Amino acid sequence: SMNPPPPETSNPNKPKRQTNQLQYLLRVVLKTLWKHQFAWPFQQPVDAVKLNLPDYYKIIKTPMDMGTIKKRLENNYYWNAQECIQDFNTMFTNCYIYNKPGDDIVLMAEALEKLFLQKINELPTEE
Numbered sequence: 619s620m621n622p623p624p625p626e627t628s629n630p631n632k633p634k635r636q637t638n639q640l641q642y643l644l645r646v647v648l649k650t651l652w653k654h655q656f657a658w659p660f661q662q663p664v665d666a667v668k669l670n671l672p673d674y675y676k677i678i679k680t681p682m683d684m685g686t687i688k689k690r691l692e693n694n695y696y697w698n699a700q701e702c703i704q705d706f707n708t709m710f711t712n713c714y715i716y717n718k719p720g721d722d723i724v725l726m727a728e729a730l731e732k733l734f735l736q737k738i739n740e741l742p743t744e745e
């Protein structure tokens with residue numbers, strides 16, 4: 619039913635960088651999705667208590683959301699772009715696993731994922 623602790627966004631032991639690709643992921647990819655009309659369900663961890671979803675964290679064992687991704691990018695938590703791309707893909711996949719085709723939340727995830735794919739297609743080569 620209690621929410622779990624959120625995903626990690628701070629860990630001094632983890633080595634960090636700021637690459638041109640990670641800068642693009644913040645300034646282009648995250649900013650584009652965050653401002654969209656369908657962003658709001660994805661701007662923070664799923665609150666299973668307030669939403670009355672007592673089975674959510676039985677089914678979803680690798681939670682992810684754009685609030686967590688925003689904190690990771692603004693904190694320079696990542697070593698490379700692939701780590702961050704994986705977090706976006708985990709967020710979309712969790713939504714499709716929990717819900718059903720044609721549900722409103724699935725239509726919202728599909729619209730955001732289309733934009734994600736259009737932006738990642740022009741990820742710059744690493745300098």
Ligand SMILES: COc1ccc2c(c1)C(c1ccc(Cl)cc1)=N[C@@H](CC(=O)Nc1ccc(N3CCC([N+](C)(C)C)CC3)cc1)c1nnc(C)n1-2
Pocket residue numbers: 658659660664665669671713716717722723
């Ligand atoms: C802060 O609000 C959030 C956050 C995360 C998610 C959601 C909403 C939403 C969400 C849903 C629709 C729209 Cl338009 C937007 C969002 N979906 C949730 C998933 C959700 O809640 N599923 C859901 C489905 C059916 C019901 N029924 C309860 C019995 C009712 N009864 C009258 C007795 C017959 C019938 C309805 C209840 C819950 C979600 N999944 N990923 C994310 C992110 N989310």
